Amino acid sequence: QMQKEQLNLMPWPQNVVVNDGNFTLTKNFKVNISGNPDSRIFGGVTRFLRRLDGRTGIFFEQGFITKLNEFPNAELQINCTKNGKIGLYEDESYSLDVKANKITINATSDLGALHGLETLLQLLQNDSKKFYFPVSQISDFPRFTWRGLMLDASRHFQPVDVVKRNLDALAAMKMNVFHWHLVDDQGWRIETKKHPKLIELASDGLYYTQEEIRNIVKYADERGILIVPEIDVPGHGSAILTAYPEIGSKVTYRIERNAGIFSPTLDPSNPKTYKILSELFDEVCPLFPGAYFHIGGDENEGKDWDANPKIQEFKKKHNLKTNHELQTYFTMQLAPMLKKHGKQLMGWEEILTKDLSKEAIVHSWRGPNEGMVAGQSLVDAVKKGYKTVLSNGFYIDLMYPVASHYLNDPMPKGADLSAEEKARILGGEATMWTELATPETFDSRVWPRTAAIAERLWSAENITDVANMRKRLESVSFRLEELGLTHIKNKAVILRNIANNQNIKSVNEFTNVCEPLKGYTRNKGGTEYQMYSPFTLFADACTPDAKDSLAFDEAVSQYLANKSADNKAKVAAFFNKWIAVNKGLVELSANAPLVQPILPLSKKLSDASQELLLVLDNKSTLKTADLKTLIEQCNTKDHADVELSVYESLKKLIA
Amino acid sequence: QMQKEQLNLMPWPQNVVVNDGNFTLTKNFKVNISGNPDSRIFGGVTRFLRRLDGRTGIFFEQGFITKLNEFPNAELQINCTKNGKIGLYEDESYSLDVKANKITINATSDLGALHGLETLLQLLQNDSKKFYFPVSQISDFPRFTWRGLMLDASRHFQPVDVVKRNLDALAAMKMNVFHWHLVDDQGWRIETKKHPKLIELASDGLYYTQEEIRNIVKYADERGILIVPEIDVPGHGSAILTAYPEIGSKVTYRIERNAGIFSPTLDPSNPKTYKILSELFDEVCPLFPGAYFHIGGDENEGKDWDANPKIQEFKKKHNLKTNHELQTYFTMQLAPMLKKHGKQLMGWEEILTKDLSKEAIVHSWRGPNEGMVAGQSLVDAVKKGYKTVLSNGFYIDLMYPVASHYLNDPMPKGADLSAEEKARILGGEATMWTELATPETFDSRVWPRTAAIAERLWSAENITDVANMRKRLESVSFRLEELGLTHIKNKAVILRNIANNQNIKSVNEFTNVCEPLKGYTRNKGGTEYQMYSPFTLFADACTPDAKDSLAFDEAVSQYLANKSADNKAKVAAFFNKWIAVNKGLVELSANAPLVQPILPLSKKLSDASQELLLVLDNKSTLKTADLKTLIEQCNTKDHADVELSVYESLKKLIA
């Protein structure tokens, strides 16, 4: 009897139907595995069972699942026809049939089966006493084969625990690529015995060991996820060149502590540049069994190359007119090195000029922030014959609203793309750059917006209803906590800190109408926060799509469409709430200096709120211009590196 | 202007004087290090600065601290005379002097300076706008040299991240020993490349690699902490004997899934037992540079030994009359293996019979729960000539109230110990056995109670005021969150699971009158929870010393002593609160099956509250016997494996 609309599935599967009846979860529940899956199925099914029991408190009979055919008559049957392989273009499909007395997952391989377990967890329903799954059939497959997250380990190092729990969350959202950005101006993160200066002098002692790398590779593979390592060259060179100044381009270098674009760049005319990289690949490539190796290539601004007559001579010698042509030549010297290791080369879009091999994968990243049209570099690459991954429009570090990411589609509008051109669009990847995210705040930035991205990368192109997505995301986000994700819980840590461990109610309520400044406006010029600055302040507790701002927006829209007393009260209750919040924050501040920065903002919201209560009763006597100004105070960006995201709805009310 | 009574220092230092004025923290703040410390001082000073900045939001100038005399006029000067060594009997003393314009830490070595940095953090004060340190002089040192936490990694495996943050917490509390219980019936946790069957067959894939162990030893050493590894033999042998059944004693074995005392025991008559153990020490001892190696020895109940005719002949051959004599013989066969690696032998008190070398350290653990007198095995061991560590009365896993641990003293009363005998009491150790703690709930069990234990092990013997200790503990527990400790934050995760992500307010308030069942009554017989059961339920969100219970108790005591209007109203406020909590839980339960187990308990409290409100106003007409039954309902242990810790005070109100 329940409506499909009540299911909180994400990604929304390709095919879904619900019918009368339920499967009831009891202490009899057991799982069986049949066919010929890869052994990764066993840990996956064990974890599934642990997670289901964590949610239900049943105390299932089974402990570790390790063999096929453990329980031929079990209530959950999982059938895999063959062994899955880690990589692109694998058959990731499955079907999930819930009947009144038995649940069946069928998949081409363990890959699909692991996906089906995630759908089955999302299907769990309950009443006041019991848990159940609705009788139903789901059949499913991904829209795109490359569905990724990039983790920047350079800006702020992200320890093994962060990486492991994020691999779990990727799996939970049916994401299958983890792109590991392991070097940038702010540090080198790969243990290297052949080139120990990179650890000694370019890491601060923060890095992944080779063994930890191998073990993370295995942890990902167990969970169906490919790792794509990145050594970004020849731009972003500050840390490499701290170790090896002799291959720099400037006619000296240090680990960079600020954010931004820097000048240190490897010298493509120096044979030593190529020898050192070749030796790096010999040591690093065997750690990563995936077929793809990302060599970066973003943001070389070219100034040291332009000034260096030796480089200018090299350009002339090779008939290379532009720095990008020189950088493609450089990249093409790396290609056979990677080929010797069995790897295909991938790079940020700047690598694409005429002589780039069509075997290279182009990582499309530039858009309006860079003066370009969103997606255009992708259109251009696939029309020229390159397989491409889209990250533009998925820059989750910039703290944009979830809808901006959810609606960003790897397949361009227009383009009159051929089918062959369409098939070169591998997928998409959210990019978590870490200038402004510590291990503590990382998850709060990645999740839950990356779950909405996961839906765009897996689900049908026409799954685009933002309100519906939001409704489903709430439970998705919640259930990620069982994997150790910190997005909700670490916020309370920060709030306790700011409030000197007084009652955090008011400061928590105030976060729910505040959002960190977006784009490149929090860390202005890159010099306001260093890579060792404290991220334990109010902006670090705030996220986009602030819960009470979204609720207030909805209340205000409903009200303005039908100005009923019930709808008006729903609005007015926010205002009374915010007046109380402000008083609570002033009280807290008497023993908490870290509340000081937000007091001007809560005062402005409280002042507006007070007047808007009179507006709603047509009892306000401020002059139009003074009412406009009062509300305008709430659009200030000057306090605590956050903004009030109720401002637009305050403006809609004042007429 | 502070008074010493307002300072939240823990352990309370040996000498504390507060004088007039404050040092004000500003953006000019810097640190300088002088003298001849061990290099561990550099990371410790860097983490200090990072932590201080996180609390204050100042954005200090210095990033990483890496050399001596970086800023010779810095506001904070740290002078160390010599290099500290990891081990026992080090001089861990320091002085900390805060003047209006300058702060100095002077210490014999970096070990004392590391401690002083923790005291300095605890001295941080603020008003509404600024942070400061009171002008004061502290000179300090520990009462005992062995101030330890034991972590059981066998019952529930505790990943690297758990171990690392707990090492930070130990340093924060000036604790200097981490005892790692790396094997038990429920799993073997040491990567062994030469005895791979222990990983393959006895670990479920859950273990620390050798490189992880070496890097945890380093992490600990950097923080002034000794690691003491334990391979527990010959009892608790289930997992060892799953890999090597041929050295068992029964005339077949599996990794144990339940809690309890089990029969599988190594065979001390079999030459292969000593061969395998000698090989294991050859592989494992090099991983742990500390001078002490724990061989366990607890709870061999001796049944397989008694039954085995070969072991009986062996006892006749060696004139060993008792199992304990035979086990001491076995233990003394290991003593030269350990000494060959430069290690001294430690074991649980069972190892002590007459022929145990007086160079063995005796770990005193038995008391009234084992039918013994608390502390007596320690008294006996030091009188006989053996150095001893007290763990009896520091069994934090059993969920006893903090005061039982805080008042437990490694120095026995009325034993007329000699000075030589006193000096054999090395110190004490909190033991976190993990039958009933996952990596998620581990910190909620350890902290903050182990912080009170830290004070017992460091501070003077006469610092015993429980109420003052509780007052100081609140901020100590809060500040541990900056080190990643999950004791507070993971509780909300559990409450969201229980509430189905509804508003957790009522369930959180109900945790504040409930405590998990104590002793050996939560997992009755060891068979109610397995090592893979779900620890995501109400008992897992509750802790001893529930805050509203303690407040209630105080309000009831004050009222019965002085039945003033105001006092009566303080008592009544709890009853009105509990009525509201029960309503909230009933509301939640409509969509949250995991609330069902607590409803009977919250209804029992609400019912008592309703009647006692009438009692307090003499509007009650219930008969004495019926009022008594009504309150007695609240002493039930049958719901959710918790108890209402307001019951005793309810009973006092109606006596």
Residue numbers in the entry:
A (entry chain B), B (entry chain A): 1 to 251, 270 to 673
Describing publication, verbatim:
No culturable Bacteroidete has yet conclusively been shown to deconstruct cellulose via the actions of a PUL7, but we recently identified and characterized a chitin utilization locus (ChiUL) from the aerobic soil bacterium Flavobacterium johnsoniae. The F. johnsoniae ChiUL consists of 11 genes: two SusC/D-like pairs for oligosaccharide capture and transport, an inner membrane transporter, a two-component sensor/regulator pair, and four enzymes. Here we present the crystal structures of the FjChiB chitinase and the FjGH20 chitobiase, as well as a small-angle X-ray scattering (SAXS) envelope of the novel FjChiA_M domain.
The fourth enzyme, the FjGH20 chitobiase/N-acetylglucosaminidase, was active only on CHOs. Thus, to illuminate these features we pursued structural determination of the FjGH20 by X-ray crystallography and were able to solve the protein structure from diffraction data extending to 1.70 Å resolution. Analysis of the protein in solution by size exclusion chromatography was consistent with a monomer unit being the prominent species (≥ 80%) and thus the dimer observed in the crystal structure is likely not of biological relevance. Each protomer consists of three domains: a central domain (residues 145–502) composed of a (β/α)8 TIM-barrel, an N-terminal domain (residues 1–144) comprising a six-stranded β-sheet and two α-helices where the helices are sandwiched between the β-sheet and the central domain, and a C-terminal domain (residues 504–673) consisting of an eight-helix bundle with two short β-strands. Several of the active site residues shown to be important for substrate binding and catalysis in GH20 members are conserved in FjGH20, including the H-x-G-G-D-E motif where a glutamic acid (Glu317) is proposed to act as a general acid/base in the reaction. The FjGH20 substrate-binding pocket is distinct in one significant way compared to the archetypical GH20 from S. marcescens (SmGH20)20,25 in that FjGH20 lacks the extended loop that is located between β-strand 7 and α-helix 7 in SmGH20. Interestingly, a portion of a loop extending from the FjGH20 helical bundle domain wraps around, and closes off, one side of the active site cleft in the TIM barrel with a tyrosine residue (Tyr538) that projects its sidechain into a position similar to the Trp685 residue in SmGH20. The FjGH20 C-terminal helical bundle is a distinct domain amongst structurally determined GH20 family members.
